[PDB]
């Protein structure tokens, strides 16, 4: 229960990006009012007060709201930051607000579906022309050769050289277990895993008319790239960045690691690729039919001269 909060506060990229994204908007926040949607243990509301906000409403649905109230008190801000328990959809604020801040991004950007609550608060509580922090988000994909996966699968074929027993038949079993499922896998990668230049496949402007309906219909787009070299293709990694009106908070595997890691879409088995193998496809992020908070990703892809294939993923538990 503390574990998610520990991961957040140990994430220097996340924490410093928000701290400085908020501080860069001092001019817009000075003497103004802020709503923190899903304030958690409260650090973003405190940052907003430290950037000069007159008053901050920290709205938190979970039990941890009590810790935000204590953090506010410890920092001497109890008369300017008000912690309000419950869903933002039904909280009663005493006034409309000049800015909304929220740490709404989930794995694969949209898992848990919190953006809809930020948009609900924007409509209900944000003053005309008010500020959203962050203001926008971009989605990226790249083909991957997951070096750790390669090693895990291949180790069965190395048992003979280490213990004198051939265990290579386990490779196919392990491949079925680790790649043959249809779950999105959250795992951190690096440049050593990235097989082609990353491609931006969608852009979300949080204030833009129609975004709520786009989320319901599916967010995404097509991509195309060409492989850097020869390797087993394991699938694709999806990640995001968000922008504070600019400072960019990135979750790319080519940038410093974050608690969001990346969302991995594994093909049913490895596919050999070579330098300049063309890969194209389409990725759509959707709410799951049974749970709208569980991310679903529909992947279409075409590797080289192979036929276009499809794989329909749901977020791992």
Ligand X SMILES: COCn1cc(CN(CC[C@@H](N)C(=O)O)C[C@H]2O[C@@H](n3cnc4c(N)ncnc43)[C@H](O)[C@@H]2O)c(N)nc1=O
Asked whether residue 14 is marked as a ligand-binding residue, the answer is yes
- In the complex with a second copy, the residue whose CB is nearer, 167 or 207, is 167
Binding to a second copy (CB under 8 A): which residues in 22-41?
Answer: 41
Active-site pick, 7, 92, 112, 212 = 112
Per-residue burial over 46-55, b if 16 or more Cβ lie within 10 Å, else e, is bbbbebbbeb
Asked whether residue 269 is marked as a ligand-binding residue, the answer is no
Are the CB atoms for 206 and 256 separated by under 8 Å?
Answer: no
Closest C-alpha to 198, from 270, 250, 143, 249: 143
Per DSSP, which regions of 173-294 are E strands? 183-187, 199-205, 219-226, 231-244, 247-250, 262-273, 278-287
Least separation in angstroms between CB 177 and a second copy: 4
Least separation in angstroms between CB 157 and a second copy: 11
Question: Would you tell me which residues interact with ligand X (CB under 6 A)?
Answer: 4, 8, 38-41, 43-44, 59-62, 64, 87-89, 103, 106, 112, 114, 117
Burial of 4 (0-12, 13-18, 19+ CB in 10 A): exposed
Phi-psi region of 51 (alpha: psi -120 to 50; beta: other; left: phi over 0): alpha
Asked whether residue 316 is marked as a ligand-binding residue, the answer is no
**Among positions 31, 94, 129, 164, the unique one binding a second copy when judged by CB under 8 A:** 164
For CA atoms 92, 97, 102, 104, give the dihedral sign.
positive
- Binding range to a second copy, per CB under 8 A, among 104-112, 148-156, 287-295, 307-315: 148-156
Closest C-alpha to 40, from 23, 61, 20: 61
Q: Decide if residue 209 touches a second copy (CB under 8 A).
A: no
Q: Which residues contact 30 (CB under 8 A, 6 or more apart)?
A: 51, 52, 53
Q: Between 88 and 127, how does the x/- string for binding to a second copy read (CB under 8 A)?
A: ----------------------------------------
Per DSSP, which regions of 6-150 are E strands? 33-37, 55-60, 81-85, 97-102, 126-133, 136-144
Q: Is 112 a catalytic residue?
A: yes
Q: Is 316 a catalytic residue?
A: no
Residues forming contacts to a second copy in the complex (CB under 8 A) are 1-3, 5-6, 9-10, 15-16, 19, 41, 43, 46-47, 50, 67, 70-71, 74-75, 152, 155-156, 159, 163-170, 173-174, 177-178
Annotated binding-site positions = 5, 14, 38, 60, 89
Residues noted as catalytic: 103, 112
Annotated binding-site positions for S-adenosyl-L-methionine = 5, 14, 38, 60, 89
């Amino acid at each position: 229960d503390v574990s998610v909060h520990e991961e957040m506060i140990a994430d220097q990229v996340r924490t410093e990006a928000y701290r400085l994204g908020i501080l860069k908007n001092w001019a817009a926040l000075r003497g103004k009012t802020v709503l923190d949607v899903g304030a958690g243990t409260g650090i973003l509301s405190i940052f907003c007060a430290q950037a000069g906000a007159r008053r901050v409403y920290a709205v938190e649905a979970s039990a941890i709201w009590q810790q935000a109230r204590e953090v506010v008190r410890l920092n001497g801000l109890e008369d300017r930051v008000h912690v309000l328990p419950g869903p933002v959809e039904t909280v009663e604020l005493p006034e409309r607000v000049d800015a909304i801040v929220s740490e709404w991004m989930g794995y694969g950007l949209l898992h848990e579906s919190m953006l809809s609550s930020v948009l609900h608060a924007r409509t209900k509580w944000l003053k005309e022309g008010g500020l959203l922090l962050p203001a926008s988000a971009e989605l990226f994909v790249a083909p991957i050769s997951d070096q750790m996966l390669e090693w895990r699968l291949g180790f069965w074929s190395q048992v003979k050289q280490h213990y004198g027993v051939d265990m290579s038949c386990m490779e196919s079993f392990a491949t079925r277990c680790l790649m043959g499922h249809s779950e999105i896998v959250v795992q951190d990668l690096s440049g050593e895993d990235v097989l082609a230049r990353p491609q931006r496949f969608a852009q979300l402007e949080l204030a833009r008319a129609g975004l709520e309906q786009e989320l319901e219909a599916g967010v995404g787009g097509r991509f195309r790239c060409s492989c850097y070299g020869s390797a087993p293709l394991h699938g694709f990694a999806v990640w995001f960045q968000v922008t504070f009106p600019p400072l960019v908070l990135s979750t790319s595997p080519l940038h410093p690691a974050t608690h969001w890691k990346q969302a991995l879409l594994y093909l049913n088995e490895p596919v050999p690729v070579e330098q300049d193998t063309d890969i194209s496809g389409e990725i759509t992020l959707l709410p799951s039919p049974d749970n709208p908070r569980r991310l679903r990703i529909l992947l279409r892809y075409k590797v080289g001269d192979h036929e276009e294939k499809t794989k329909d993923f749901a977020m791992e538990d």
